[PDB]
């Protein structure tokens, strides 16, 4: 990826062995966990397209996952050429370059073009639209991970709300909904699907209660 | 923004002068960035020390076979041979600099230097930069060619590379 | 975070992996100690709310404090709103508009807002603010966790 | 009488029965007409019998309510 | 409805309750038979889109053709909005502005800006395309209701001609067919259907076959 | 026929034997075919109505469909002088009288009318007109020479889809009904008669059936 | 089809009757081969759409395979009319308008318009795309005249190399995919399938070996 360089002139910089091994590890230990795209987001900060395909290529297993994500950036390509076509009009007076849903998925874009590409004055925000696009692809493929569905997320007898909380609120943030849906679900199915020993003591506390007074309420 | 070459250029050993050209990278970016490629010699190999070995009054000059030195070979930075890019740019005068190639999508590292308007080859020629200074050195090599191409002394490319 | 180059401006400077490594393996491994809220102010020092934010994501597991620590935020930017007008309007060139709560946040805006306003004469530091909430917030979940 | 989540379809209980009762208790339910476009396509096709469970599945996700229908119809 | 005062001013007047009982028991009474649409059409007389969703939110049960038909009203229109712009900006006074489709449904505008749509001169007629919309609704509606089809109706061997000719023209009736494809099938599929006997007196009856011959042909 | 000289006048040229004999071979090997149509229509291109009383009266045999054309030409001979009056009168030089019924039909006149009628300015054709009542008889022929309707078409047990769609086809090509309506069978009774295997087969594959997915879906 | 005078121009000239009785006699003795293409494309080179919907609706029998290239070339015809769209303004002095989708296929248009089509200054070639139409459905039609798929094929104990070589190729050339998976099939799927004996000759060669010496080798 490109970064400042000493002074104020950004050259490019290769992507480091140690972040490649630190991305392999943690697909290996964490397999696609919800937190992977804000640890992938941080790991490529302001990386060219070519890095961004290292590091989905250095990936190992999950290869169906991978072609889903592939097929998805192809898609948005596509959908990015049909709302960015060229429609005549008068010729700039400045030329610069043009990023095709090919040039910008890195497949037939040569580094030295997407070098200019991010480097030029304006900039074009090729890494950022890959970067959307490779972040809609893995929110795809962790809200397909998910193993069962939220409306199962179901309290045992003995329990704790702890885990059952816990156990909840990951499979909700998995899940794919707009905020306002999980604004109505985290008030009509979290004290629903309770253990009835707590379950009325959270009743008792009141319908808008928030979750820290649930949670002191069933502690223990 | 469009990358500029120039070929310093050589009848027998003795120099005869520079041509520079621009290339247009904004109309024909992979055409052009093999041309400036080839000229730097940054990709191993490349223009420097070969000739132009078919050289027309009032055509063109053709130049570039790095490889067989005589018009069958030569090879571009992505492999021996690739698409023609586009025909947006027309052989519209002397000066125009375009690729040769062997009919359609077979383009290498061989390009002409017209001398004159050659609006017949128009739609099968990718054109991609247009002499910048040095057209009289262009002129001058004619008289060292023939109607059917054979030159009568050796021209190279003594030297080239990139200015801008 | 802002690294402030020797003799030079503050250039901005992402965070790097070992940060965010460090700051993953002390909340799996020492789960939430009253040391881990130093250990946290001590890793993320001169952090923009986008750092802050991605170092609160990163952390895997342990949601119900983390929802608990995300309300917290949110009462305190609903605070600060109430008690901070919020003008409107044109603006003038060179100096940027007031910071909302949920801006102040940055739940609402870009890097590019963050680097202005810290970076503004006179300086409005808003990770020193975002900064106190997540430590508020961190201190009801180890107060809870005991 | 019943929640919207405790809806399900019987092993022989036809389809029209059980979309009526669905529909009858989310209308008596109380919601914002958002919330209901996703609990429409999150719940009918879900609590359905196994097999046209699978029926509806086959038709898509975004398939319309005479479809769904008309699919599993006798 | 909208009842035109004699000599004078049309003056809107509120849906009577016998209307509207008449209507909900109809319902009740008789499901969804092939004659509700004609009798829906006559209670609902120069009524407003306000009058006709009321007379639609009246009738208990049947939830799924409710949605069903609520889900036609939306395809009409989104059709409408599609095939026909919507201004804006500042209006004229005393021109009412463009209705749009979701106004026309009723679901977005009162009751004053549909007495203005149906006053305007030159008139709009958002009650008869609404009404229109509704009886797509209905009839969709109602052959869905259809219990067989009408392609798989034969008469039974002691089953009269009387009888299976009511079948017949009730199926027809309820059939979704165009009208001159509805023409052919009640020319050819009547008399190829029927029962050997009276098939054999048809054919010799030929040409021209109409229903009262055809019946005082099959007698006894 | 009436060959056009290349750069010259459209002069008239005497029907060759080999059309002649290829109609009376068509005619005698193939009996009455959909197809015969357009092979009659193709043989007879641009000819007088001597030349196609000729290729009529060449035909050997079947005198029944015969004389049910010739029937239908004068019915339609009949119809083209009711609804078209008839001048009579001294006629100004250079211009035709004009042309009767049974004159258009060319039983009572000469070869010279018809010349002239065809080459008149503006061009009257005779001969597409008698050309168009010879296909109006020859499809009643062919539908009276279909051996089976239909609506009584049903798949064998064993008899693949292919010769079932291969029979519909070509009684459907037989059919009288309007296009329309033969739109609306093909769309419905194919699916609505095949054998119950393949019939739930193609319920599978649901709407908008199309006559290659079918057979790709029946294969086996 | 149009053909070239002594001047060289050209001119509209009737079917000539021994192409449809060599088209037909083909179509019917041959069935449907990959050998019908050349024929077809060698019998009516210079067609009009007129006469190429002639030699399609003369083909008796087969009514399914026709109507597959009638859907075929209906598809076609659609994405023409939306691949290029009519420009508006004044037109030139020296051009005028040109034809639909519909009428490539010369349905609703006279032959004197095809004849000017083809003959315009510059001429539009209308023959020869609803040519390129028809010879795509006629691939598509032999496509599913192929009586197996193209990995079912192993060769028997006892049949020998050369008929399977000979089924390999024909289900090859029916196949189609592509050009490139065809020259990986036949190096791949040809040497992987055959008798142990003979198979085991074949990899005494290696993979370099041609198809001469690869069956001159099973040979004696």
Known sequence: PIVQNIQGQMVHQAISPRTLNAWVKVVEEKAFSPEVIPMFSALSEGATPQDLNTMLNTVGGHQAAMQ???????????????????????????????????????????????????????????????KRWIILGLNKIVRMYSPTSILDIRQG???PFRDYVDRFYKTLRAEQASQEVKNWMTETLLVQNANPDCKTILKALGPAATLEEMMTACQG | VNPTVFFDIAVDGEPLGRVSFELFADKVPKTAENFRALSTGEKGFGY????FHRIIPGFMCQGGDFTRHNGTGGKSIYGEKFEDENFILKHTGPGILSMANAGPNTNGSQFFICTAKT?????????????????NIVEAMERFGSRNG???????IADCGQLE
């Not at chain 1, 076509?85 to 040039?103: C, F, K, L, N």
């Open chain 1, 68 to 130: 889903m994500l592939k097929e998805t950036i192809n898609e948005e390509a596509a959908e990015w050429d049909r709302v960015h076509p060229v429609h005549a009009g008068p010729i700039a007076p400045g030329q610069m370059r043009e990023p095709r849903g090919s040039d910008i998925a890195g497949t037939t874009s040569t580094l030295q073009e997407q070098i200019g590409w991010m480097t030029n004055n304006p900039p074009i925000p090729v890494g950022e639209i890959y």
């Open chain 1, 157 to 159: 007898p003995k329990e």
């Open chain 2, 48 to 51: 420097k020390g070969s000739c």
């Open chain 2, 119 to 135: 609006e017949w080859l128009d739609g099968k020629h990718v054109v991609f930069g247009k002499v910048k200074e040095g057209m």
């Open chain 2, 150 to 156: 054979k030159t009568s002394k050796k021209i190279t």
